[PDB]
């Protein structure tokens, strides 16, 4: 019951939907095809309800990980970009929109954690995690602190744990191996040990969460934090002279944050799949189309190479893409639930001092 000859697009209200509506205006002026952009509340929860009965939008924008369950239910059509179009996007962004060897969405934007620092308290941010204890000593003598970030959630602590060899599921040729988990290896032990040592040596508080860390950095009480592009607007209001750079390395190896990819899927029940392909490939995924959305609300880093190179003149965006390329695409498989439990459990047990790092990791699996 989706109307044929027009396009209905769903995108979250936190995105530049008025900018996207301008791209739809250009598409209608050129092709005669009316495009209607909507930002319904909780669209990612409404989509599987209406798409299951042949309803819903023609196009849906959301984070790539949710599209795994959509394709599992057969709600997303397979897209058909040729070789030349795929070369215009960074190769790793296509890994985020693949389900069982099939492309099921177009990569739009790229987000990842970065190292955020106070330029006044710290003109040169550290390049390594090993420097941070000495840096905290010099800052604690001034009533300040070196680093405060959300220790309570594994999304924020995994980049350090993965740095020396930790991994979620062994990634091969677009297929995750649910049997090869890398949470209890020598790389993950060294990262958690350094994290726990930061807490035991009183450089970080084991109770610091997202809200505490954000308040301390925006009030100038700490020199660094770790967060993503979604947090920049709160710092802009704080008027703190901040910068965004690459995450510190551990044992000479980069921090490996998870990568979220805003993706555009095509409804499997849509009768306008070719129009949807034409709109996404030839109007939106261009320098002109992404700029219209970006002008409305910034996308952060984008998958389109040519426009990312322009946006990367903002050093905060360049750092975001740099950390993302040094990180890993967040897996879109249901087995991530068990992975999150293991990492969250091992950190809380080891940080409080109840268990050793080795005991904390092996007990999180059992």
């Amino acid at each position, epitope marked *: 019951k989706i109307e044929e000859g027009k396009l209905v697009i769903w995108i*979250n209200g*936190d995105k530049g939907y008025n900018g996207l509506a301008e791209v739809g205006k250009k598409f209608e002026k050129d092709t005669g095809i009316k495009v209607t952009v909507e930002h319904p*509340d*909780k669209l*990612e*929860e409404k989509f*599987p*309800q209406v798409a299951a009965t042949g309803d819903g939008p023609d196009i849906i924008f959301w*984070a790539h*990980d*949710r599209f795994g369950g959509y394709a599992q239910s057969g709600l997303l059509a397979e897209i058909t970009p040729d070789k030349a179009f795929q070369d215009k996007l960074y190769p790793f962004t296509w890994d985020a929109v693949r389900y069982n060897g099939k492309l099921i969405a177009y990569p739009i934007a790229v987000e990842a*954690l970065s190292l955020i620092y106070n330029k006044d308290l710290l003109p040169n941010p550290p390049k390594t995690w090993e420097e941070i204890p000495a840096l905290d000593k010099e800052l604690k003598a001034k009533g300040k602190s070196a680093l405060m970030f*959300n220790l*309570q*959630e594994p*999304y*924020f602590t995994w980049p350090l744990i993965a740095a020396d060899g930790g991994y979620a599921f062994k990634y091969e040729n677009g297929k995750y191996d649910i049997k090869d988990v890398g949470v209890d290896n020598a790389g993950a032990k060294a990262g958690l040990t350094f994290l726990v040592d930061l807490i035991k040596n009183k450089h970080m508080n084991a*109770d610091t*969460d*997202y*809200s*505490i860390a954000e*308040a301390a950095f925006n009030k100038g009480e700490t020199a660094m934090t770790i967060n*993503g592009p*979604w947090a920049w607007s709160n710092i802009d209001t704080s008027k703190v002279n901040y910068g965004v750079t690459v995450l510190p390395t551990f044992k000479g190896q980069p921090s490996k944050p*998870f990568v*979220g990819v805003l993706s555009a899927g095509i409804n499997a029940a849509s009768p306008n799949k070719e129009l949807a392909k034409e709109f996404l490939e030839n109007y939106l995924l261009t320098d002109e189309g992404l700029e219209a959305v970006n002008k409305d609300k910034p996308l952060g880093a984008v998958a389109l190479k040519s426009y990312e190179e322009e946006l990367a003149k903002d050093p905060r965006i360049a750092a975001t893409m740099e950390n993302a390329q040094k990180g890993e695409i*967040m897996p879109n498989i249901p087995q*991530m*639930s*068990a*992975f*999150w*439990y*293991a990492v*969250r459990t091992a950190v809380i047990n080891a940080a409080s001092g109840r268990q050793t790092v080795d005991e904390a990791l092996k007990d999180a699996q059992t």
Partner: antibody, heavy 124, light 104 residues
Framework: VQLVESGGGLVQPGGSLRLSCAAS????????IHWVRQAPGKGLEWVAS????????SYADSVKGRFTISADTSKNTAYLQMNSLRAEDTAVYYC??????????????????WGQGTLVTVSS | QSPSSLSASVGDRVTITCRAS??????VAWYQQKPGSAPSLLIY???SLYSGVPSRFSGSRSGTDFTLTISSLQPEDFATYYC??????????FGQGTKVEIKR
């Protein structure tokens, strides 16, 4: 979109009771399901939560070690297993949904949907 | 805990301050509960009005203080109001209830 509760009733101190929260209209896997109880004439008290997508469960101090929250994704239903019950556990028990957009978010959106509540009386 | 009491008239402006939110600076939600019914969400993230709630309800944050304001009390507004915080992200605490009652 609905949250239907069942499993309440009478129970003795030291006994056990298992509450159920069957959901429809959304997938509990991608939400936090909360249990909130309210003693007669008293205010709300948070009990436990489960966020299966993020592999997390949480418990209030007053029930930690005695209650166990779980979920059955195939049945779209959450459970509260209450053990070692005491008279102070007597209350109307609600289940509620807390919405989440992204994996990085802290709690933001509160509890938009609530069950009808079921009365649990712990007494000899 | 037994809920606090506040007596007001139709048309009055009422401002409720969350007492449990003095713990931390996290997001604050407000709820309305009538006798014999489940609470209903009014406001989330301190100031975002939940879909469908009348615009006379508003929430604000000024530093560590979170308030809920009813600009002009309507007859259907006399009920009990709760604020909800998340001190450590995993923990959840509801404040003491504030029951708005009818002046006569």
């Amino acid at each position: 979109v609905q949250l239907v509760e069942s499993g309440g009733g009478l129970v003795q101190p030291g006994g056990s009771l298992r509450l159920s929260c069957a959901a429809s209209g959304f997938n509990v896997y991608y939400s936090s399901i909360h249990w909130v109880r309210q003693a007669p004439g008293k205010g709300l008290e948070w009990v436990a939560s489960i966020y299966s997508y993020y592999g997390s469960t949480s418990y209030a101090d007053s029930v930690k070690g005695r209650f166990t929250i779980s979920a059955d994704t195939s049945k779209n239903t959450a459970y509260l297993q209450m053990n070692s019950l005491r008279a102070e556990d007597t209350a109307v028990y609600y289940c509620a949904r807390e919405y989440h957009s992204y994996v990085y978010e802290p709690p933001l959106y509160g509890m938009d949907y609530w069950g009808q509540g079921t009365l649990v009386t712990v007494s000899s | 805990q037994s809920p606090s009491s506040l007596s007001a008239s139709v048309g009055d402006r009422v401002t409720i301050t969350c007492r449990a939110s003095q713990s931390v600076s996290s997001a604050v939600a407000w709820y309305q509960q009538k006798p014999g019914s489940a609470p209903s969400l009014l406001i989330y993230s301190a100031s975002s009005l939940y879909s469908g709630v009348p615009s006379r309800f508003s929430g604000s944050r000024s530093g560590t203080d979170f308030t809920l304001t009813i600009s002009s009390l309507q007859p259907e507004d006399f009920a009990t109001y709760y604020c909800q915080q998340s001190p450590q992200g995993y923990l959840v605490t509801f404040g003491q209830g504030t029951k708005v009652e009818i002046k006569r």
